[PDB]
Design a protein around this ligand. Structure first.
Ligand SMILES: Nc1ncnc2c1ncn2[C@@H]1O[C@H](CSCC[C@H](N)C(=O)O)[C@@H](O)[C@H]1O
Length: 424
């Protein structure tokens, strides 16, 4: 097998953790390290359990030598520093656990400049670049505010690599739903599209992991990392994606510009209905547009002519109207805005969908495969969106806007009400 694996496996028996009746060895699988059922397991069977003594959460850092100095930091920043530091101490509780952690994953946060060029024009690149920079500024701030003014607690220097290594280990291993917890033993199961339950989470302290599927002997025990993450999210959080086109998403960002002559009123309408000055709408392949996207698009493109809808008079129905539609001019405007954005975006990629699909037909390397898959999907979504609005441009006269809806209850053909007027 592998030295480190045993130096870690044993350390688990010597901690009391892995008992004698735990059907699950740790072997090498296509996805690195994994848990292979030592014998037939069945739905909901407890695979293993670990002592809170072994976690690595915001409480562990607070209840440690550096908890005082990290008393103010956000939880994820706190944990990174603890991880980096614990890693340096050749007398840390997790000396052997650190000896098993991969020095890297396929998460876009580790991709070289060449590998990242494979994502040119993708929203995943923007997101990865944006996240990388932000974790950087945050970690350079931690260096001068805590790491440097305390060289006693932080002996060895800390590089950007040191931080990123940790930020990754936290993003691809920590168990959220229980919010950041590490569990050296159960921190081995891999993800499988086969699992569709997501019930594995459980704790009697003691972390208890149970197999969601029935696994025969020799096979690998899996779990569903997350049924809702988009492919772009799986790519950055862990180092992998799924072929399932229903995981492809593209998130649209909307906002009420401050240079908008009706900013104040518009903002009041949006917040009054659950939306901020800035709103993010996730668009998944083959799904129907998110509720609120169209009305918010209409609010953004409002304009002088229909500005009358922002008066106190409609401050109680304005959203219902935005939901139905405002006017052909408003509708036509937003449709073009979206369509242009899609085309603009689509043109930012360096490969066609056909090229991506042909590439997929051959043998691609982990990261290259991730890039191709992601970009093909984003292009699919982008085109789906543009298609939806191209159709709306055609059906531009099938919609009954405000004015029409208004004159629907005129009652022109009522009675000769003048006969009564003369009877008093
Ligand atoms: N279905 C899958 N395909 C590819 N890699 C996977 C995977 N499920 C899990 N992984 C890998 O394992 C990580 C989760 S931690 C699980 C243990 C890991 N296999 C190891 O050897 O250390 C992920 O971030 C990813 O790099």
């Amino acid at each position: 097998l592998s030295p480190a694996v045993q130096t870690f496996w044993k350390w688990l028996q010597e901690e009391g953790v892995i008992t004698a009746k735990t059907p699950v060895k740790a072997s090498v699988v296509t996805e690195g390290l994994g848990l292979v059922a030592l014998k037939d397991i069945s739905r909901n069977d407890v695979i293993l359990q670990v002592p809170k003594r072994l976690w690595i959460n915001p409480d562990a850092v607070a209840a440690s030598e550096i908890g005082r100095v990290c008393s103010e930091l956000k939880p994820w920043l706190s944990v990174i520093l603890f991880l980096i530091r614990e890693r340096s101490r050749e007398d840390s509780v997790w000396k052997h656990y650190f000896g098993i952690l991969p020095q890297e994953t396929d998460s876009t946060i580790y991709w070289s400049e060449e590998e990242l060029q494979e994502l040119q024009g993708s929203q995943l690149l923007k997101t990865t670049v944006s996240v990388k920079e932000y974790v950087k500024n945050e970690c350079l701030k931690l260096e001068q505010e805590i790491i440097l003014p305390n060289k006693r607690l932080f002996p060895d220097p800390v590089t950007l690599d040191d931080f990123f290594w940790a930020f990754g280990i936290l993003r691809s291993r920590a168990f959220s739903r229980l919010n950041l917890v590490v569990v050296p033993m159960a921190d081995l199961i891999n993800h499988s599209a086969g699992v569709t339950t997501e019930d594995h989470a459980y704790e009697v302290y003691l972390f208890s992991l149970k197999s969601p599927l029935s696994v025969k002997a020799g096979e690998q025990v899996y779990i569903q990392y997350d049924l809702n993450k988009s492919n772009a999210e799986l790519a950055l959080d862990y180092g992998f994606i799924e072929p399932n086109e229903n995981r492809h998403a593209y998130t649209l960002t909307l906002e009420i510009s401050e240079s908008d002559p009706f900013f104040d009123d518009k903002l009041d309408v949006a917040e009054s209905n659950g939306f901020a000055q800035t709103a993010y709408f996730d668009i998944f392949y083959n799904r129907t547009l998110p509720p609120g996207l169209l009305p918010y698009l209409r609010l953004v493109a409002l304009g002088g002519t229909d500005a009358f809808l922002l008066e106190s008079l409609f401050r109680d129905t304005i959203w219902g109207h935005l939901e139905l539609s405002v006017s052909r001019d408003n509708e036509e405007l937003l449709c073009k805005a979206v369509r242009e954005a899609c085309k603009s975006a689509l043109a930012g990629y360096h490969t066609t969908i056909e090229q991506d699909r042909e590439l997929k037909e051959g043998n691609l390397d982990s990261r290259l495969a991730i890039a191709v898959g992601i970009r093909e999907g984003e292009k699919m979504v982008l085109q789906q969106i543009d298609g939806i609005f191209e159709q709306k441009e055609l059906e531009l006269d099938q919609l009954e806007y405000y004015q029409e809806r208004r004159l629907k209850d005129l009652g022109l053909c009522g009675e000769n009400g003048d006969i009564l007027e003369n009877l008093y």
